[PDB]
Short mmCIF file of all heavy atoms in Angstrom, two decimals:
data_model
loop_
_atom_site.label_atom_id
_atom_site.label_comp_id
_atom_site.label_asym_id
_atom_site.label_seq_id
_atom_site.Cartn_x
_atom_site.Cartn_y
_atom_site.Cartn_z
N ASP X 209 0.87 -1.20 0.00
CA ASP X 209 0.00 0.00 0.00
C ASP X 209 0.91 1.25 0.00
O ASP X 209 1.43 1.59 1.08
CB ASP X 209 -0.98 0.00 1.18
CG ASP X 209 -2.09 1.01 1.03
OD1 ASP X 209 -2.04 1.77 0.05
OD2 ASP X 209 -3.01 1.04 1.89
N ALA X 210 1.08 1.86 -1.18
CA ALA X 210 1.93 3.06 -1.42
C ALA X 210 1.44 4.25 -0.57
O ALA X 210 2.27 5.13 -0.25
CB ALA X 210 1.94 3.41 -2.89
N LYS X 211 0.16 4.24 -0.18
CA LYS X 211 -0.49 5.32 0.61
C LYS X 211 -0.25 5.11 2.11
O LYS X 211 -0.66 5.97 2.88
CB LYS X 211 -2.00 5.38 0.37
CG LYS X 211 -2.44 5.46 -1.09
CD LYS X 211 -2.43 6.86 -1.63
CE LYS X 211 -1.39 7.10 -2.71
NZ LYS X 211 -1.48 8.47 -3.28
N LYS X 212 0.36 3.98 2.50
CA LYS X 212 0.53 3.61 3.92
C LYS X 212 1.95 3.12 4.16
O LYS X 212 2.11 2.01 4.65
CB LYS X 212 -0.45 2.51 4.30
CG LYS X 212 -1.91 2.91 4.25
CD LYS X 212 -2.77 1.96 5.04
CE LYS X 212 -4.14 2.52 5.31
NZ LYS X 212 -4.85 2.81 4.04
N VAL X 213 2.94 3.94 3.83
CA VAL X 213 4.38 3.66 4.10
C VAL X 213 4.83 4.59 5.22
O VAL X 213 4.74 5.81 5.05
CB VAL X 213 5.23 3.81 2.83
CG1 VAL X 213 6.72 3.68 3.10
CG2 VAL X 213 4.83 2.78 1.79
N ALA X 214 5.27 4.00 6.33
CA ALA X 214 5.91 4.68 7.49
C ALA X 214 7.42 4.69 7.31
O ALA X 214 7.99 3.64 6.98
CB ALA X 214 5.53 3.94 8.73
N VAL X 215 8.08 5.83 7.47
CA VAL X 215 9.56 5.87 7.54
C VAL X 215 9.96 5.80 9.01
O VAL X 215 9.34 6.48 9.82
CB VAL X 215 10.18 7.13 6.89
CG1 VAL X 215 10.37 6.92 5.41
CG2 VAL X 215 9.36 8.37 7.18
N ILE X 216 11.02 5.07 9.30
CA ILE X 216 11.57 4.94 10.68
C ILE X 216 13.09 4.82 10.66
O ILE X 216 13.62 4.07 9.81
CB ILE X 216 10.90 3.74 11.38
CG1 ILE X 216 11.46 3.57 12.79
CG2 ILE X 216 11.08 2.48 10.56
CD1 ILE X 216 10.72 2.58 13.62
N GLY X 217 13.76 5.46 11.63
CA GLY X 217 15.21 5.26 11.90
C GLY X 217 15.62 5.72 13.30
O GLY X 217 14.97 6.63 13.85
N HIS X 218 16.70 5.17 13.86
CA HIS X 218 17.22 5.52 15.20
C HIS X 218 18.47 6.42 15.13
O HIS X 218 19.34 6.18 14.29
CB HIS X 218 17.56 4.22 15.91
CG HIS X 218 18.05 4.44 17.29
ND1 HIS X 218 19.33 4.07 17.67
CD2 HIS X 218 17.46 5.02 18.35
CE1 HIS X 218 19.50 4.40 18.93
NE2 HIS X 218 18.36 4.98 19.38
N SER X 219 18.58 7.37 16.05
CA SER X 219 19.78 8.23 16.23
C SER X 219 20.06 9.01 14.93
O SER X 219 19.17 9.77 14.49
CB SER X 219 20.95 7.38 16.70
OG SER X 219 21.87 8.13 17.49
N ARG X 220 21.22 8.84 14.31
CA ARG X 220 21.56 9.64 13.11
C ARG X 220 20.61 9.24 11.99
O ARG X 220 20.36 10.05 11.06
CB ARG X 220 23.04 9.47 12.76
CG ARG X 220 23.38 8.14 12.12
CD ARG X 220 24.84 7.74 12.23
NE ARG X 220 25.27 7.69 13.62
CZ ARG X 220 26.53 7.53 14.02
NH1 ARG X 220 27.50 7.38 13.13
NH2 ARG X 220 26.83 7.53 15.30
N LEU X 221 20.08 8.03 12.05
CA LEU X 221 19.08 7.56 11.07
C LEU X 221 17.68 7.99 11.49
O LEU X 221 16.80 8.03 10.61
CB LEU X 221 19.20 6.04 10.93
CG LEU X 221 20.55 5.57 10.39
CD1 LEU X 221 20.51 4.09 10.03
CD2 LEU X 221 20.97 6.39 9.18
N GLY X 222 17.46 8.33 12.76
CA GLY X 222 16.28 9.11 13.18
C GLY X 222 16.26 10.45 12.46
O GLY X 222 15.28 10.72 11.75
N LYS X 223 17.34 11.21 12.59
CA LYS X 223 17.52 12.51 11.89
C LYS X 223 17.09 12.32 10.44
O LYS X 223 16.22 13.09 9.99
CB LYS X 223 18.97 13.00 12.02
CG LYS X 223 19.43 13.25 13.45
CD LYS X 223 20.86 13.73 13.53
CE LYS X 223 21.61 13.26 14.76
NZ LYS X 223 21.07 13.83 16.01
N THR X 224 17.66 11.31 9.77
CA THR X 224 17.44 10.95 8.35
C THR X 224 15.94 10.69 8.09
O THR X 224 15.40 11.31 7.18
CB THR X 224 18.27 9.71 7.98
OG1 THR X 224 19.64 10.00 8.26
CG2 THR X 224 18.12 9.29 6.54
N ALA X 225 15.30 9.82 8.87
CA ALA X 225 13.89 9.44 8.68
C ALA X 225 13.00 10.68 8.76
O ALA X 225 12.07 10.82 7.95
CB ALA X 225 13.48 8.40 9.70
N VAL X 226 13.28 11.58 9.70
CA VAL X 226 12.45 12.80 9.87
C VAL X 226 12.63 13.68 8.63
O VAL X 226 11.65 14.31 8.25
CB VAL X 226 12.80 13.57 11.14
CG1 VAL X 226 12.09 14.91 11.16
CG2 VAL X 226 12.50 12.78 12.40
N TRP X 227 13.82 13.71 8.04
CA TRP X 227 14.09 14.52 6.81
C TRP X 227 13.45 13.86 5.59
O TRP X 227 12.93 14.56 4.73
CB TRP X 227 15.59 14.72 6.60
CG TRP X 227 15.88 15.57 5.41
CD1 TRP X 227 16.71 15.27 4.38
CD2 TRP X 227 15.33 16.87 5.11
NE1 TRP X 227 16.75 16.29 3.48
CE2 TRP X 227 15.90 17.28 3.89
CE3 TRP X 227 14.45 17.72 5.76
CZ2 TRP X 227 15.61 18.51 3.31
CZ3 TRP X 227 14.14 18.93 5.18
CH2 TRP X 227 14.71 19.32 3.96
N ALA X 228 13.52 12.55 5.51
CA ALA X 228 12.86 11.75 4.47
C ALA X 228 11.36 12.06 4.52
O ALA X 228 10.77 12.30 3.46
CB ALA X 228 13.16 10.30 4.69
N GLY X 229 10.78 12.11 5.72
CA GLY X 229 9.35 12.47 5.92
C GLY X 229 9.06 13.92 5.54
O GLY X 229 8.08 14.16 4.82
N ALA X 230 9.87 14.86 6.01
CA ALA X 230 9.73 16.30 5.68
C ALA X 230 9.81 16.50 4.16
O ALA X 230 8.91 17.12 3.62
CB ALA X 230 10.79 17.11 6.37
N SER X 231 10.86 15.98 3.52
CA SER X 231 11.24 16.35 2.14
C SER X 231 10.52 15.46 1.13
O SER X 231 10.55 15.82 -0.06
CB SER X 231 12.73 16.28 1.95
OG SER X 231 13.17 14.93 1.89
N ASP X 232 9.91 14.35 1.58
CA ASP X 232 9.11 13.45 0.70
C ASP X 232 7.74 13.18 1.29
O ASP X 232 7.56 12.26 2.07
CB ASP X 232 9.81 12.11 0.46
CG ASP X 232 9.14 11.28 -0.62
OD1 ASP X 232 7.94 11.56 -0.95
OD2 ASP X 232 9.82 10.39 -1.16
N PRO X 233 6.71 13.95 0.89
CA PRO X 233 5.36 13.82 1.46
C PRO X 233 4.58 12.54 1.13
O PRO X 233 3.48 12.39 1.60
CB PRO X 233 4.62 15.04 0.87
CG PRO X 233 5.72 16.00 0.46
CD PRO X 233 6.81 15.09 -0.05
N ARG X 234 5.16 11.63 0.35
CA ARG X 234 4.54 10.33 0.04
C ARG X 234 4.52 9.45 1.28
O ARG X 234 3.65 8.61 1.37
CB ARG X 234 5.31 9.64 -1.08
CG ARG X 234 5.23 10.38 -2.41
CD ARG X 234 5.93 9.56 -3.45
NE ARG X 234 7.35 9.52 -3.17
CZ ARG X 234 8.20 8.73 -3.81
NH1 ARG X 234 7.77 7.93 -4.76
NH2 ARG X 234 9.49 8.73 -3.48
N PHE X 235 5.43 9.65 2.22
CA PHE X 235 5.45 8.86 3.48
C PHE X 235 4.22 9.26 4.30
O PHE X 235 3.94 10.44 4.45
CB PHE X 235 6.78 9.00 4.23
CG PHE X 235 7.95 8.48 3.43
CD1 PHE X 235 8.98 9.34 3.03
CD2 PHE X 235 8.00 7.15 3.03
CE1 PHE X 235 10.04 8.85 2.27
CE2 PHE X 235 9.06 6.66 2.27
CZ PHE X 235 10.08 7.51 1.89
N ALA X 236 3.48 8.25 4.76
CA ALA X 236 2.20 8.41 5.48
C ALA X 236 2.47 8.75 6.95
O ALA X 236 1.62 9.41 7.58
CB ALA X 236 1.41 7.14 5.33
N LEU X 237 3.61 8.31 7.49
CA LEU X 237 3.86 8.37 8.95
C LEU X 237 5.36 8.30 9.20
O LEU X 237 6.05 7.62 8.47
CB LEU X 237 3.09 7.20 9.60
CG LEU X 237 3.63 6.70 10.94
CD1 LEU X 237 3.19 7.59 12.08
CD2 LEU X 237 3.15 5.29 11.19
N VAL X 238 5.84 9.01 10.20
CA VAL X 238 7.28 9.27 10.42
C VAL X 238 7.57 8.84 11.84
O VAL X 238 6.89 9.34 12.72
CB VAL X 238 7.61 10.76 10.24
CG1 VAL X 238 9.07 11.07 10.48
CG2 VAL X 238 7.19 11.27 8.88
N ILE X 239 8.59 8.02 12.05
CA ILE X 239 9.04 7.60 13.41
C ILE X 239 10.48 8.05 13.65
O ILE X 239 11.39 7.56 12.96
CB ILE X 239 8.82 6.09 13.58
CG1 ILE X 239 7.33 5.78 13.48
CG2 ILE X 239 9.38 5.65 14.92
CD1 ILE X 239 7.01 4.33 13.40
N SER X 240 10.64 8.96 14.60
CA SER X 240 11.91 9.54 15.10
C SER X 240 12.33 8.79 16.37
O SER X 240 11.80 9.10 17.46
CB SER X 240 11.73 11.02 15.36
OG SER X 240 12.67 11.51 16.30
N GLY X 241 13.27 7.85 16.24
CA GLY X 241 13.85 7.13 17.38
C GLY X 241 15.05 7.84 17.96
O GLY X 241 16.13 7.65 17.43
#
């Protein structure tokens, strides 16, 4: 389901996941670990 993709990453990859979410609005949900 392309409409229901969550991005997730921890620490420096947390930083990354939040930017992936910010800069790519196709992600449905963002997890900052």
Side-chain angles (χ1 to χ4, degrees):
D209 194 355
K211 307 276 113 176
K212 295 198 164 60
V213 173
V215 274
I216 179 170
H218 182 242
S219 208
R220 75 202 57 188
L221 297 191
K223 298 180 214 294
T224 303
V226 171
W227 182 233
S231 73
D232 190 342
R234 294 184 293 170
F235 298 117
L237 155 80
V238 179
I239 297 170
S240 156

